[PDB]
Amino acid sequence: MKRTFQPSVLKRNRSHGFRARMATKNGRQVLARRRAKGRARLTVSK
Amino acid sequence: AVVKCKPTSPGRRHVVKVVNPELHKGKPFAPLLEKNSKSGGRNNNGRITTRHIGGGHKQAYRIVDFKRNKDGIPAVVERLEYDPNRSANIALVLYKDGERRYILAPKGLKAGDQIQSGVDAAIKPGNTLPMRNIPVGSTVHNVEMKPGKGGQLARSAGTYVQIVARDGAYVTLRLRSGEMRKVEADCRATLGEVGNAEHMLRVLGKAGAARWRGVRPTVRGTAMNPVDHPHGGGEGRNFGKHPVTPWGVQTKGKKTRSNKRTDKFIVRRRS
RNA sequence: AGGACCGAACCGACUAAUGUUGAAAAAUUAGCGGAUGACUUGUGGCUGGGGGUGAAAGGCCAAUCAAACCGGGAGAUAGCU
RNA sequence: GCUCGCCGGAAGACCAAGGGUUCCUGUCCAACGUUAAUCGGGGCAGGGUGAGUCGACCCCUAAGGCGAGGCCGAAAGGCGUAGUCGAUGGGAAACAGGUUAAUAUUCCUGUACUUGGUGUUACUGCGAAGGGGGGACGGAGAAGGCUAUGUUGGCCGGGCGACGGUUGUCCCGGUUUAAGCGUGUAGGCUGGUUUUCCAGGCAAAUCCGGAAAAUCAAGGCUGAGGCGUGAUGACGAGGCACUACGGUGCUGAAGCAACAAAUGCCCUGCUUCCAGGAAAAGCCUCUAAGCAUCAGGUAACAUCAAAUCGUACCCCAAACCGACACAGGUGGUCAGGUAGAGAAUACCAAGGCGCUUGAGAGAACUCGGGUGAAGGAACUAGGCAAAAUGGUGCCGUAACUUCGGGAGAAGGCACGCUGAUAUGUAGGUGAGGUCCCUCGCGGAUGGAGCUGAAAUCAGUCGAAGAUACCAGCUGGCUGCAACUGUUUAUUAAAAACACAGCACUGUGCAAACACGAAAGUGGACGUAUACGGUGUGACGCCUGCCCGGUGCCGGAAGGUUAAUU
RNA sequence: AAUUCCUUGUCGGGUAAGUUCCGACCUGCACGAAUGGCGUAAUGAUGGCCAGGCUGUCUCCACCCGAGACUCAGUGAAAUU
RNA sequence: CUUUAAUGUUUGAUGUUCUAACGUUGACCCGUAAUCCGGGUUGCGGACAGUGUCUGGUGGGUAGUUUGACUGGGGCGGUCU
Numbered sequence A: 001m002k003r004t005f006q007p008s009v010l011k012r013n014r015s016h017g018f019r020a021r022m023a024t025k026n027g028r029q030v031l032a033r034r035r036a037k038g039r040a041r042l043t044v045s046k
Numbered sequence B: 001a002v003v004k005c006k007p008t009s010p011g012r013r014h015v016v017k018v019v020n021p022e023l024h025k026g027k028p029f030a031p032l033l034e035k036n037s038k039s040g041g042r043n044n045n046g047r048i049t050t051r052h053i054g055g056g057h058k059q060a061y062r063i064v065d066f067k068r069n070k071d072g073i074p075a076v077v078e079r080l081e082y083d084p085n086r087s088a089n090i091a092l093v094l095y096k097d098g099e100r101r102y103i104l105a106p107k108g109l110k111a112g113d114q115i116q117s118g119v120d121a122a123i124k125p126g127n128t129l130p131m132r133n134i135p136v137g138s139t140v141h142n143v144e145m146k147p148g149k150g151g152q153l154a155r156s157a158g159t160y161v162q163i164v165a166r167d168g169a170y171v172t173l174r175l176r177s178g179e180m181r182k183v184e185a186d187c188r189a190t191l192g193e194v195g196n197a198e199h200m201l202r203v204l205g206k207a208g209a210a211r212w213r214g215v216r217p218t219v220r221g222t223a224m225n226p227v228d229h230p231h232g233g234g235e236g237r238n239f240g241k242h243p244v245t246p247w248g249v250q251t252k253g254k255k256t257r258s259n260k261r262t263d264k265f266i267v268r269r270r271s
Numbered sequence C: 001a002g003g004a005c006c007g008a009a010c011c012g013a014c015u016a017a018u019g020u021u022g023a024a025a026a027a028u029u030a031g032c033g034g035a036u037g038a039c040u041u042g043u044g045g046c047u048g049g050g051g052g053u054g055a056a057a058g059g060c061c062a063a064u065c066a067a068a069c070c071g072g073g074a075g076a077u078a079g080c081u
Numbered sequence D: 001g002c003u004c005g006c007c008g009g010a011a012g013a014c015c016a017a018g019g020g021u022u023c024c025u026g027u028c029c030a031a032c033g034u035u036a037a038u039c040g041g042g043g044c045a046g047g048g049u050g051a052g053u054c055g056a057c058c059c060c061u062a063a064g065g066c067g068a069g070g071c072c073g074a075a076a077g078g079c080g081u082a083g084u085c086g087a088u089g090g091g092a093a094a095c096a097g098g099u100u101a102a103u104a105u106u107c108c109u110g111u112a113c114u115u116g117g118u119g120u121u122a123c124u125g126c127g128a129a130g131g132g133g134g135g136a137c138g139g140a141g142a143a144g145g146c147u148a149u150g151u152u153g154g155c156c157g158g159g160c161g162a163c164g165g166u167u168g169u170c171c172c173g174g175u176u177u178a179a180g181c182g183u184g185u186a187g188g189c190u191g192g193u194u195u196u197c198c199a200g201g202c203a204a205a206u207c208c209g210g211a212a213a214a215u216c217a218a219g220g221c222u223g224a225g226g227c228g229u230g231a232u233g234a235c236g237a238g239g240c241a242c243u244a245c246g247g248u249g250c251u252g253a254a255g256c257a258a259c260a261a262a263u264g265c266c267c268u269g270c271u272u273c274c275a276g277g278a279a280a281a282g283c284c285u286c287u288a289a290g291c292a293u294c295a296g297g298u299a300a301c302a303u304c305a306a307a308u309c310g311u312a313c314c315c316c317a318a319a320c321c322g323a324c325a326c327a328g329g330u331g332g333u334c335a336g337g338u339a340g341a342g343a344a345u346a347c348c349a350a351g352g353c354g355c356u357u358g359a360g361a362g363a364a365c366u367c368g369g370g371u372g373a374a375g376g377a378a379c380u381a382g383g384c385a386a387a388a389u390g391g392u393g394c395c396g397u398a399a400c401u402u403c404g405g406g407a408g409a410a411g412g413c414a415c416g417c418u419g420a421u422a423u424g425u426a427g428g429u430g431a432g433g434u435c436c437c438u439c440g441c442g443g444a445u446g447g448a449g450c451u452g453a454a455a456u457c458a459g460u461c462g463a464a465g466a467u468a469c470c471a472g473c474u475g476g477c478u479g480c481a482a483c484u485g486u487u488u489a490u491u492a493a494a495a496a497c498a499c500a501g502c503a504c505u506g507u508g509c510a511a512a513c514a515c516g517a518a519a520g521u522g523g524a525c526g527u528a529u530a531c532g533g534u535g536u537g538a539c540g541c542c543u544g545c546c547c548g549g550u551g552c553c554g555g556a557a558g559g560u561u562a563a564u565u
Numbered sequence E: 001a002a003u004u005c006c007u008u009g010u011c012g013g014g015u016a017a018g019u020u021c022c023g024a025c026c027u028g029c030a031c032g033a034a035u036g037g038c039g040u041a042a043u044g045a046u047g048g049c050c051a052g053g054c055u056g057u058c059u060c061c062a063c064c065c066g067a068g069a070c071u072c073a074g075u076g077a078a079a080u081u
Numbered sequence F: 001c002u003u004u005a006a007u008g009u010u011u012g013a014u015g016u017u018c019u020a021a022c023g024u025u026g027a028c029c030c031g032u033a034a035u036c037c038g039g040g041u042u043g044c045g046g047a048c049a050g051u052g053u054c055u056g057g058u059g060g061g062u063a064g065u066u067u068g069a070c071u072g073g074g075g076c077g078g079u080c081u
């Protein structure tokens, strides 16, 4: 049985990374919303 | 020529293929090749804009001379070659100054012939002339529409047009579709018909022989649901509708041409 | 030569039994089909919700589809329990 | 520690992705481990990852992404040129042995190779954001030459056997060695050299392309393997002494030939077929503006440099994806012996395991199997399940047919072991010896040794010789769909979808059509033998009557009819 | 007849016995010619029917070999109320 | 008053030629190292095509909705002042 989550670090950053959020107007509002809540880490960039 | 295949398998029973033993067997002339990747019928929005396109075999583009620019320098045909990008064959010519080019091969042209371009060219097949220098009533191919633009009519295998009249600054042409059109007399055309006339006498034979040419299966509208096609739906085989395209327009008899800035050059429709 | 034949890897899923608070939220066992092709597979890319893709089953779009998921209008409305 | 069992194309070994200290040592047993625990991938403390040559980084690009100006759009924004990123692809170089509790192509010993900077010396025309060559490319098939590897013999070391025999045609073990440097072989491709000229290669060119003579016919390119050296070295059974019994230090014999042989190498080869099979840089060559004693280029020697980051461990899994120490999933590489066509199957080697609750008993009943008197589908919706058939060689084989098929149709005969033909046959492979030789990785003759089917005749053992594993049940009539394929991931694989073939209709190119407020893009770098839509669905014989209704195509005497005025 | 209600129509074959099968008739409730008509070799994990071999499918069950169930020591659930 | 031929009458339309708005997904030059874009020269088309406002027809391509009650269950039939 093949499940839905098949990990890959390269495609994790290209999709949900920091520089991918900053590249669009709507992505920049994700970081603003998460800073307002007070999240310890913004993106998946670990 | 055109040869049947023995039925040693179910997929070979109905296969007919045309074979030309005069075609080159080696690799093409490298300095005249390019690259073209496949699109799948998808535009720059990523959506399918033309259906039933996809897959196939890899191909390379051959740069074919459709203008026949250089005049007064004779050429000689070296070899006839295969071309995956069109239904006609091509010929590699070497001019007397050392330049090589690709052109569409007309009928009856073989290795060792001589072709010519310009205004004082001879009237023999393969030569290209302005249509005011060609006698009325001759068969020509690779016909321009705007002077200096390049060949854009009668380009498939076995096709041609005929000059039926010359009335002023224009000439009247009878196209393969059967409709008569007026073009300027300063456009160029190549004498003769286009080779590979037996191209249409082949039978693909199997479902997978059309997949080698990048064609994907066609689903009939009647086999779909109402949400997919205007024809879909039913308990059994019901149609009860006027046939239409997947976007709701009449598909059987309705005319779709509408272009008012080019109608002055149409003499009569193809009927 | 072949969308040729038999048959392993590989890809499927026709029958029966077991299981059904399962070893497993779709499997195991014994048989079964294709197996040089319209084949199968690794990496990356593109198509975004009345929209996509579909050899067409209303199938699939993260165990969710006759209109995905998250947040908001919002304490929608409920002659009903 | 001695026995027993299991895997062995894996349940062994190694990489990638993914994980992140699970790695090694000392110590502890509360919690975790489906039981106990002195044990642990558990708790605590300490230790452990060494690179010019491996990978990344770096140079170059594919699909694609972003995009200065620009075009377009109420705003947000969309597309896109010059450019710039983007591997899954192209680009320089290291091998053997030894060592740690834990790393090693990284440390040590031996022997190597690459790309740059600087200096000296001897010669010389150098120069790009440009030109040319090269890099550079498909499927299938066949054969030859080899090697990795294995088997036997020779040699060397040890043995003479718990119960009849075993000094022999007996038993056990070993018989290993790299990169690099030199030679250029089986094979593959291609005629060579010199002059004169030129509408081409965005200008130039001595370079590529083209043309004309002369002259010689052998030149060049590429290429597995073998041999020599590397190597008087390393390794090596075993023996010798401690042992703090876990391991230490010393020496060390032989180290050859024959045959068989890859799916690996020559081979990016050769033959053939149509569906006609990436790009750019590194590399070689040519010049332009420029410099001319210079600066630059070539060669020899010397000397300097090669930074930074990863490196432990998990090896198809107890460490990754599945909530679990979960009978599931996970890309690539290696490939021993006997039997065998085989990577199937059976038993084994190297190596790794006995699956983290056990001890008894031997009721019904459930699960997985073995055998069964006489009958043989009487069972049941239905021969569902089970039983049966099953290999090779030869003989033989029906209706029908699109002449290929049907067909492995159906059916019959042989099959072990030993002896002889023949102290091992046909065939394969081929040493010393002889002769030539343009002497050498040669040619001719020759047969020693090694390997080795199949067949015939005679004998012989058993109830049975395709003895295990493995391994078609067959025939007759009929509906549907021509066939190979696709489909409801998770109750439907079918007569449903697709298909080759047929027909109608639209489309003259700024094509019709589709995605888009638009700009643009696909169709297509195509041009009526082409492209889109619709229906039918191989092939054979065919496809009849109706134009009132509803569509579509064309016509225009008349009625009525919008904004407007 | 993948189409036929009355219907298990009627006739012939096969069985001791045949609502299914095969060949016909024509009275086609309510076939019919590219939402194609009629045939058709080969092909099918396709629907129906009949034979040979083979059998625990059955008459009608019997014995045996293993894993649970049963007793002992350790750990230790669930639906429901 | 009608059936009429004709000069002169306010227009409505239908054609032909022109270049100067406008179109060019024809050719050449420049920005420029550029198949975008803009500027220049010229050929072709040309007041047509094309766009804006207003307006008659068509328009399940799309959207919002409606489709009664009684009833010896509901539907069919019948009824509703």
Ligand SMILES: [Mg+2]
Pocket (backbone or CB within 6 Å): A002, A003, A004, C063
């Ligand atoms: Mg899942």
Ligand SMILES: [Mg+2]
Pocket (backbone or CB within 6 Å): A012, A016, A044
């Ligand atoms: Mg993530």
Ligand SMILES: [Mg+2]
Pocket (backbone or CB within 6 Å): B036, B037, B038, B058, B059
């Ligand atoms: Mg292509």
Ligand SMILES: [Mg+2]
Pocket (backbone or CB within 6 Å): B039
């Ligand atoms: Mg394209």
Ligand SMILES: [Mg+2]
Pocket (backbone or CB within 6 Å): B047, B048
């Ligand atoms: Mg679309």
Ligand SMILES: [Mg+2]
Pocket (backbone or CB within 6 Å): B051, B052, B218
């Ligand atoms: Mg199409």
Ligand SMILES: [Mg+2]
Pocket (backbone or CB within 6 Å): B036, B037, B038, B057, B058, B059, B060
């Ligand atoms: Mg291509």
Ligand SMILES: [Mg+2]
Pocket (backbone or CB within 6 Å): none
């Ligand atoms: Mg003119």
Ligand SMILES: [Mg+2]
Pocket (backbone or CB within 6 Å): B207, B210, B211, B215, B216, B217, B218
């Ligand atoms: Mg197709």
Ligand SMILES: [Mg+2]
Pocket (backbone or CB within 6 Å): none
């Ligand atoms: Mg078709």
Ligand SMILES: [Mg+2]
Pocket (backbone or CB within 6 Å): B218, B219, B220
């Ligand atoms: Mg179709």
Ligand SMILES: [Mg+2]
Pocket (backbone or CB within 6 Å): B218, B219, B220, B221, D534
């Ligand atoms: Mg269709």
Ligand SMILES: [Mg+2]
Pocket (backbone or CB within 6 Å): B222, B223, B231, B232, B233, B234, B237, B238, B239
């Ligand atoms: Mg329908």
Ligand SMILES: [Mg+2]
Pocket (backbone or CB within 6 Å): B222, B223, B224
């Ligand atoms: Mg259907």
Ligand SMILES: [Mg+2]
Pocket (backbone or CB within 6 Å): B223, B224, B225
């Ligand atoms: Mg359907």
Ligand SMILES: [Mg+2]
Pocket (backbone or CB within 6 Å): none
């Ligand atoms: Mg859609």
